[PDB]
Amino acid sequence: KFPRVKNWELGSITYDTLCAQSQQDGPCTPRRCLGSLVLPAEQLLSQARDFINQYYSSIKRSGSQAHEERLQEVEAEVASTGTYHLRESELVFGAKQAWRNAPRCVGRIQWGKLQVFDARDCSSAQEMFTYICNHIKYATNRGNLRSAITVFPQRAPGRGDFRIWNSQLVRYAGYRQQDGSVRGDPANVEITELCIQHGWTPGNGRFDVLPLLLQAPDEAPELFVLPPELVLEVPLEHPTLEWFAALGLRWYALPAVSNMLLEIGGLEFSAAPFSGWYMSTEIGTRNLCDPHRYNILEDVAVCMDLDTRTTSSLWKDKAAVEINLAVLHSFQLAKVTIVDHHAATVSFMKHLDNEQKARGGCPADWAWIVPPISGSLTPVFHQEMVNYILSPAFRYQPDPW
Amino acid sequence: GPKFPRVKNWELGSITYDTLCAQSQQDGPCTPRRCLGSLVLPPAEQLLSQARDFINQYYSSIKRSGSQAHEERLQEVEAEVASTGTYHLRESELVFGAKQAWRNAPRCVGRIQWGKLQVFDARDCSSAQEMFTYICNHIKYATNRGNLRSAITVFPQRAPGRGDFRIWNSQLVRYAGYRQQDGSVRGDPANVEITELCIQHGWTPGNGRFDVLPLLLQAPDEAPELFVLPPELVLEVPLEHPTLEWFAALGLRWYALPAVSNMLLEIGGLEFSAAPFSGWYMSTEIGTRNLCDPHRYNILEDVAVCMDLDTRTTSSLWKDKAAVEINLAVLHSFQLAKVTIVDHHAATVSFMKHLDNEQKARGGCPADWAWIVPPISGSLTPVFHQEMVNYILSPAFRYQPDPW
Ligand code: HEM
Ligand code: HEM
Ligand SMILES: Cc1cc(N)nc(C[C@@H]2CNC[C@@H]2OCCNCCc2cccc(F)c2)c1
Ligand SMILES: Cc1cc(N)nc(C[C@@H]2CNC[C@@H]2OCCNCCc2cccc(F)c2)c1
Ligand SMILES: C[C@H](O)[C@H](O)[C@H]1CNc2nc(N)[nH]c(=O)c2N1
Ligand SMILES: C[C@H](O)[C@H](O)[C@H]1CNc2nc(N)[nH]c(=O)c2N1
Ligand SMILES: [Zn+2]
């Protein structure tokens, strides 16, 4: 019934009772675990009712007059039109809850602090662009980063979706070369090629910021260039290794995810970009060291004069550590908010304890929460986790092309 | 495509489908409502179905499925269970079963070696003294003066109404952990309970950080008996670093032979409660888990101080820098002393080859992602980018509760 959850460093035990609230199935069965894989009116009515019940309970007014009447408005709207609409205060609560509920997010200690921009009165791609430019300015705040989400109009039965084609608001281009190598970020070759086809004049650098492709319902997407001054970037240098600055490496300040679906009370928001601040291992380990990304390990190790001929000299491990240190030092120097993996995972353990008290559990995906270097050096490695789907939720959605 | 799990490698873009999971006859701990993949601990009628399944597996592996010899063996097994409530394996059946149990183990990254296991049949064993002899022979063979060889020794199976053969120690070689008066521990904190049981049963304890424990061996229906391993049998490696001359002065060491001794080996419904097995180390198990876990030897702060690192702030990456040098010391020292070891990069590469081999041979491979990905430098290894399906196949190694 209720799974026992143990921490192996400290010997402490808790029981997850929150998983009983899950009404949506994951990919696992008793026959096989798939935890490591990356990917009608009556049903809508009950999702809506549950959500409204969640909202009135959060403001302590459960059972009040305002509660009963709001339930009746929703019922009347769905019965007549097949759908309904959220009040701004309900949207705000719903967005925070979807963050709180996200099992892959190590940053959830911050869940209560989220600026929510209501963009549901948007009727064109041009208006979308203005809203996005305002989000970026707010979120960036000259390096003193603030968590934010902007919510565009919900999906509707009659028509096509509002969509941002880009997976993040800020990404670097990937240019496929004559010889089948890539200049820039190999993760972005396909979106880069789409941008060119839709009329963008491409650069030829390793760190060219991509334009946005924004789609209003049932229209071809439109191209918008981000004003250079809005996109804060950090040149990478190393505290003791002088030649590192000459590698010419940089990363953008703002991690801003733009391709996920936000589901609240049965309603679905197909464009709802959100942003926080980076955990340094995302940049230092994954973006720069992954073999299928910028893949810089070998170059850094040679500058460091390490023996690259054999794996047993641990040259990959040594180079990776220095790159991560360069990221942390450079962000700190440029006064841009960042968190290291030790500090982030310590705050996550506190979030786990807060949530055990508040709700009797916390859905968490161990493979995503444990950092990609120095796993067992962090307290989360030794912590058992239960993974399940609660709503409101963020959900992956297929690329619109 | 097909209705079997689709499995993707995100570095290479390649896809396979797992069809082997269809052969699974035992439930794991997950359901559609919640994943429990990260948790460490998960009649004649019943026996016969498991026995028939295993005999069918054996006859398929020798390509004699449906033959007269196959049907005759099946008839011999059920007749034996009819008269006795149990049955017994042939020598070649035990050998097949033990290798298949290793092949099936989802938490083992060393499975490229599965076909090369020396299997010692100790099913004639009738006393604690004789268990000790067999165990000493295992260690001598497996250690081979540092050129390590994979092996298992199989003691008699569980029997109706008669007590079990059990080895009380979790490994054949482990260090004592001595509880101090201030509440701290000298030696290995993992071993505090077993250390205290050895003293209760008459062992005169040392007072060092690396005292090898004696064995507590239990023959059926007797109290366990205490046996000290002759020191010349236990190969150890003093730890030094290739460039940091002071590292040798910390007096650190580790033993050569990883030999798990408390797992149950299950073959065709038969239960082997004592069947210790051994291979060689992957270096991260010593360098990262044994030496750096905060609940183990916990030496990270000590080494960082000698390295002159800023241990008062997380963002200096002092833990990461120290862990790398400790892992490097382990690899260098084993290589110097000519004792077999494998680094995490070479092991995970070889496991990627094993995955490909098994895709062709059986249509999949059960694997536990959280255990296969090494505890340092995870995404620098190929296995981090590889999706994995986890399920239980028999023959199997299974955890068993401590005898005390
Ligand atoms: C405030 C600082 C934050 C930090 C340090 C942080 C940290 C992280 C990290 C390290 C990941 C895994 C990233 C990856 O490997 O792709 C992640 C995932 C995620 N986070 Fe956060 N987060 C923050 C804020 C936010 C905010 C504001 C939201 C939404 C309101 C959010 C929702 C999510 C979601 C939905 C995922 C899963 C994304 C996916 O499947 O690709 N987080 N977080
Ligand atoms: C040939 C050298 C071998 C290497 C490098 C190797 C590697 C490993 C590693 C690194 C682990 C994880 C250990 C941990 O973190 O506790 C493991 C687990 C395991 N291996 Fe191996 N292995 C080898 C040989 C063997 C052999 C000979 C067997 C049995 C015949 C075996 C069966 C197992 C089993 C049953 C586990 C799970 C143990 C548990 O749940 O505590 N492996 N292996
Ligand atoms: C195919 C697929 C499925 C899925 N769920 N997700 C993806 C994005 C991948 C995940 N791994 C790299 C890349 O996503 C990279 C962007 N991740 C930033 C997360 C983040 C960090 C800090 C603050 C935030 F607000 C958000 C792809
Ligand atoms: C409670 C519990 C359950 C379980 N399944 N397992 C344990 C042993 C723990 C697992 N993690 C550390 C420790 O096991 C330490 C010993 N593991 C060595 C595995 C190995 C390596 C190379 C060759 C071999 F033949 C065997 C405890
Ligand atoms: C195959 C595996 O699930 C995949 O590489 C995952 C592992 N853990 C991860 N963890 C985080 N935070 N982000 C990721 O993209 C991944 N990728
Ligand atoms: C909580 C978590 O399941 C636990 O700490 C696991 C994670 N992965 C591991 N992986 C290996 N190889 N060995 C272990 O002991 C563990 N411990
Ligand atoms: Zn699962």
Short mmCIF file of C-alpha atoms in Angstrom, two decimals, chain B residues 21-280:
data_model
loop_
_atom_site.label_atom_id
_atom_site.label_comp_id
_atom_site.label_asym_id
_atom_site.label_seq_id
_atom_site.Cartn_x
_atom_site.Cartn_y
_atom_site.Cartn_z
CA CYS B 21 11.18 -9.31 -20.61
CA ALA B 22 8.37 -11.64 -21.85
CA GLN B 23 10.23 -14.53 -20.14
CA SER B 24 10.00 -12.91 -16.67
CA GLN B 25 8.08 -15.09 -14.20
CA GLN B 26 8.48 -12.92 -11.08
CA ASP B 27 7.02 -9.47 -10.21
CA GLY B 28 9.18 -6.46 -9.29
CA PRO B 29 8.06 -3.63 -6.93
CA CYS B 30 6.69 -1.10 -9.52
CA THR B 31 3.08 -0.53 -10.64
CA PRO B 32 1.39 1.83 -13.15
CA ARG B 33 0.64 4.24 -10.25
CA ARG B 34 4.26 4.49 -8.90
CA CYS B 35 7.86 3.58 -9.71
CA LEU B 36 9.93 1.99 -6.91
CA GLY B 37 13.03 1.46 -9.11
CA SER B 38 15.37 3.36 -6.75
CA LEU B 39 14.73 1.18 -3.62
CA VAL B 40 17.58 -1.11 -2.51
CA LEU B 41 15.40 -3.87 -1.02
CA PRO B 42 12.46 -5.19 -3.08
CA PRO B 43 4.33 -26.64 -2.32
CA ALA B 44 4.99 -29.43 -4.86
CA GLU B 45 2.88 -27.61 -7.47
CA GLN B 46 5.04 -24.46 -7.23
CA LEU B 47 8.40 -26.30 -7.22
CA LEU B 48 7.60 -28.42 -10.29
CA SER B 49 6.71 -25.46 -12.51
CA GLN B 50 10.00 -23.75 -11.61
CA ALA B 51 11.90 -27.03 -12.10
CA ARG B 52 10.26 -27.74 -15.48
CA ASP B 53 11.09 -24.20 -16.61
CA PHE B 54 14.75 -24.56 -15.65
CA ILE B 55 15.08 -28.02 -17.29
CA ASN B 56 13.58 -26.55 -20.48
CA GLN B 57 16.18 -23.73 -20.30
CA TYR B 58 18.99 -26.28 -19.89
CA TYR B 59 17.82 -28.44 -22.84
CA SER B 60 17.45 -25.32 -25.08
CA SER B 61 21.03 -24.27 -24.25
CA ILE B 62 22.42 -27.65 -25.37
CA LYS B 63 20.03 -27.66 -28.39
CA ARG B 64 18.16 -30.84 -27.41
CA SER B 65 14.76 -29.29 -26.75
CA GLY B 66 11.88 -31.74 -27.31
CA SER B 67 14.27 -34.71 -27.45
CA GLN B 68 13.95 -38.08 -25.70
CA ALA B 69 16.69 -37.13 -23.17
CA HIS B 70 14.78 -33.90 -22.42
CA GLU B 71 11.46 -35.71 -21.76
CA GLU B 72 13.23 -38.41 -19.73
CA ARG B 73 14.90 -35.79 -17.50
CA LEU B 74 11.56 -34.01 -17.00
CA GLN B 75 10.02 -37.38 -15.97
CA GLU B 76 12.95 -38.08 -13.62
CA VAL B 77 12.55 -34.69 -11.87
CA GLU B 78 8.79 -34.99 -11.10
CA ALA B 79 9.20 -38.61 -9.94
CA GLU B 80 11.93 -37.41 -7.55
CA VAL B 81 9.69 -34.59 -6.25
CA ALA B 82 6.76 -37.06 -5.99
CA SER B 83 8.70 -39.39 -3.67
CA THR B 84 10.91 -36.89 -1.75
CA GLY B 85 9.36 -33.41 -2.02
CA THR B 86 12.63 -32.22 -3.66
CA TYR B 87 15.08 -33.05 -6.49
CA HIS B 88 18.82 -32.76 -7.30
CA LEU B 89 20.70 -31.12 -10.18
CA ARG B 90 23.23 -32.84 -12.40
CA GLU B 91 26.76 -31.36 -12.34
CA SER B 92 26.44 -29.74 -15.81
CA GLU B 93 22.97 -28.38 -14.89
CA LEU B 94 24.48 -26.66 -11.78
CA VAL B 95 27.27 -25.19 -13.93
CA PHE B 96 24.76 -23.86 -16.50
CA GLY B 97 22.52 -22.50 -13.72
CA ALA B 98 25.25 -20.63 -11.84
CA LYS B 99 26.51 -18.90 -15.05
CA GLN B 100 22.92 -18.02 -16.02
CA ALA B 101 22.31 -16.49 -12.53
CA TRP B 102 25.28 -14.14 -13.10
CA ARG B 103 24.12 -13.36 -16.70
CA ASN B 104 20.68 -12.48 -15.27
CA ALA B 105 21.88 -10.13 -12.44
CA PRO B 106 20.57 -6.63 -13.30
CA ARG B 107 22.94 -4.78 -10.94
CA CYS B 108 26.20 -6.24 -12.31
CA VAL B 109 28.25 -4.15 -14.76
CA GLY B 110 30.84 -6.98 -15.13
CA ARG B 111 28.58 -9.34 -17.13
CA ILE B 112 30.77 -9.34 -20.29
CA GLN B 113 32.70 -12.05 -18.38
CA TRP B 114 29.62 -14.23 -17.61
CA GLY B 115 30.71 -17.24 -19.75
CA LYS B 116 34.03 -17.46 -17.86
CA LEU B 117 33.14 -18.60 -14.36
CA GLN B 118 34.88 -21.46 -12.59
CA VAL B 119 32.16 -23.38 -10.68
CA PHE B 120 33.28 -25.42 -7.64
CA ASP B 121 30.82 -28.11 -6.61
CA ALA B 122 30.89 -28.34 -2.83
CA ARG B 123 27.52 -30.12 -2.49
CA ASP B 124 29.16 -32.97 -0.57
CA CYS B 125 30.11 -30.64 2.33
CA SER B 126 29.04 -31.92 5.77
CA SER B 127 30.67 -29.70 8.42
CA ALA B 128 31.79 -26.16 9.29
CA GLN B 129 35.44 -27.30 9.22
CA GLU B 130 34.96 -28.63 5.68
CA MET B 131 33.26 -25.35 4.61
CA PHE B 132 36.38 -23.56 5.78
CA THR B 133 38.62 -25.82 3.66
CA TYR B 134 36.44 -25.26 0.56
CA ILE B 135 36.41 -21.47 1.21
CA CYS B 136 40.24 -21.36 1.59
CA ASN B 137 40.60 -23.28 -1.68
CA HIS B 138 38.22 -20.80 -3.41
CA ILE B 139 40.32 -17.81 -2.22
CA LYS B 140 43.59 -19.44 -3.34
CA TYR B 141 42.17 -20.24 -6.80
CA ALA B 142 40.38 -16.89 -7.28
CA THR B 143 43.32 -14.73 -6.05
CA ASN B 144 45.95 -16.55 -8.16
CA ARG B 145 48.70 -14.26 -6.75
CA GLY B 146 46.97 -11.17 -8.21
CA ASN B 147 45.90 -12.52 -11.64
CA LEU B 148 42.27 -12.82 -10.46
CA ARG B 149 39.87 -15.46 -11.77
CA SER B 150 36.04 -15.42 -11.40
CA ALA B 151 34.69 -18.28 -9.30
CA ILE B 152 31.78 -19.61 -7.26
CA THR B 153 31.62 -22.45 -4.67
CA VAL B 154 28.21 -24.10 -4.16
CA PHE B 155 27.33 -25.69 -0.79
CA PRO B 156 24.38 -28.05 -0.23
CA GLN B 157 20.86 -26.75 -1.00
CA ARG B 158 18.02 -26.02 1.46
CA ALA B 159 16.23 -29.20 2.49
CA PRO B 160 12.78 -29.98 4.04
CA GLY B 161 12.90 -29.64 7.87
CA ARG B 162 16.72 -29.41 8.12
CA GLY B 163 18.71 -26.22 8.91
CA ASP B 164 20.63 -24.18 6.32
CA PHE B 165 24.29 -23.88 5.44
CA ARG B 166 25.00 -20.17 6.00
CA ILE B 167 28.05 -17.97 5.86
CA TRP B 168 27.37 -15.16 8.35
CA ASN B 169 29.82 -12.60 6.86
CA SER B 170 28.51 -10.54 3.89
CA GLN B 171 31.85 -11.02 2.12
CA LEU B 172 34.74 -13.48 2.59
CA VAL B 173 37.14 -10.58 3.15
CA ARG B 174 35.97 -7.51 5.18
CA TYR B 175 37.52 -5.13 7.74
CA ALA B 176 36.48 -4.88 11.40
CA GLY B 177 34.57 -1.89 12.76
CA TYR B 178 35.18 -1.19 16.45
CA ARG B 179 32.68 1.02 18.31
CA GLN B 180 34.53 3.68 20.39
CA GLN B 181 33.58 5.17 23.78
CA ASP B 182 32.95 8.66 22.34
CA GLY B 183 30.54 7.03 19.84
CA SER B 184 32.81 7.13 16.77
CA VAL B 185 34.08 4.04 14.91
CA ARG B 186 37.58 2.78 14.18
CA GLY B 187 37.77 0.77 10.91
CA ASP B 188 34.69 0.13 8.72
CA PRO B 189 31.36 1.37 10.19
CA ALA B 190 29.46 -0.97 7.85
CA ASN B 191 30.80 -3.93 9.85
CA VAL B 192 30.05 -2.93 13.47
CA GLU B 193 27.39 -5.62 14.08
CA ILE B 194 29.30 -8.58 12.58
CA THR B 195 32.46 -7.45 14.40
CA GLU B 196 30.54 -7.57 17.72
CA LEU B 197 29.17 -11.05 16.88
CA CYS B 198 32.71 -12.35 16.23
CA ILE B 199 33.83 -11.11 19.68
CA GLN B 200 30.77 -12.68 21.38
CA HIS B 201 31.72 -16.00 19.73
CA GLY B 202 35.29 -15.88 21.05
CA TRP B 203 37.37 -13.75 18.68
CA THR B 204 40.17 -11.69 20.25
CA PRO B 205 39.88 -8.33 18.44
CA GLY B 206 42.60 -6.04 17.14
CA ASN B 207 42.49 -2.26 17.37
CA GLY B 208 43.39 -1.20 13.81
CA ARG B 209 41.62 0.53 10.89
CA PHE B 210 42.08 -2.49 8.59
CA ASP B 211 41.84 -5.67 10.64
CA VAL B 212 40.57 -8.60 8.52
CA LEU B 213 37.50 -10.24 10.12
CA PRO B 214 37.29 -13.98 10.87
CA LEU B 215 34.50 -16.11 9.35
CA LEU B 216 31.42 -17.27 11.17
CA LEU B 217 30.33 -20.47 9.41
CA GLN B 218 27.11 -22.34 10.12
CA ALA B 219 26.42 -25.97 9.27
CA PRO B 220 22.82 -27.25 9.54
CA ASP B 221 21.24 -27.09 13.03
CA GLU B 222 24.46 -26.01 14.78
CA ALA B 223 25.62 -22.70 16.24
CA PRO B 224 28.10 -20.95 13.94
CA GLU B 225 31.81 -21.72 14.33
CA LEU B 226 34.64 -19.21 14.16
CA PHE B 227 37.55 -19.51 11.70
CA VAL B 228 40.51 -17.14 11.23
CA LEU B 229 41.83 -16.83 7.67
CA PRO B 230 45.61 -17.46 7.37
CA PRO B 231 47.15 -14.02 6.60
CA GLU B 232 49.18 -15.37 3.65
CA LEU B 233 45.85 -16.15 1.87
CA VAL B 234 44.43 -12.58 2.02
CA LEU B 235 46.12 -10.40 -0.63
CA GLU B 236 46.04 -6.63 0.15
CA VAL B 237 47.20 -3.51 -1.72
CA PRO B 238 48.78 -0.55 0.17
CA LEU B 239 47.52 2.68 -1.40
CA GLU B 240 49.85 5.30 -2.92
CA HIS B 241 49.35 8.14 -5.49
CA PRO B 242 51.45 8.64 -8.70
CA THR B 243 52.31 12.33 -8.11
CA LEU B 244 51.23 13.20 -4.56
CA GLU B 245 54.08 11.75 -2.49
CA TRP B 246 52.29 12.23 0.87
CA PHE B 247 49.34 9.96 -0.05
CA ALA B 248 51.30 6.81 0.91
CA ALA B 249 51.68 8.30 4.42
CA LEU B 250 47.89 8.06 5.12
CA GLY B 251 48.39 4.31 5.61
CA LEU B 252 45.35 3.39 3.52
CA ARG B 253 44.87 -0.09 2.01
CA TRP B 254 42.31 -2.41 0.42
CA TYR B 255 41.98 -6.16 -0.17
CA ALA B 256 42.26 -7.64 -3.67
CA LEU B 257 39.31 -10.08 -3.72
CA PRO B 258 35.66 -8.98 -3.78
CA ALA B 259 33.82 -12.11 -2.69
CA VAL B 260 30.11 -11.82 -1.87
CA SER B 261 29.05 -14.49 0.60
CA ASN B 262 25.48 -13.82 1.80
CA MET B 263 23.35 -14.05 -1.35
CA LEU B 264 20.96 -16.91 -2.10
CA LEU B 265 21.43 -18.69 -5.45
CA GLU B 266 18.08 -19.95 -6.81
CA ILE B 267 18.07 -22.55 -9.63
CA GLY B 268 14.82 -24.33 -10.73
CA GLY B 269 13.14 -23.71 -7.38
CA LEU B 270 16.12 -25.14 -5.50
CA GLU B 271 17.68 -22.77 -2.98
CA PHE B 272 21.43 -22.57 -2.34
CA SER B 273 21.73 -20.49 0.86
CA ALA B 274 25.56 -20.65 0.83
CA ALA B 275 27.26 -20.10 -2.54
CA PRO B 276 29.96 -17.38 -2.29
CA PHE B 277 31.21 -15.91 -5.57
CA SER B 278 34.08 -13.60 -6.52
CA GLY B 279 35.40 -11.59 -9.50
CA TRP B 280 37.63 -8.49 -9.51
#
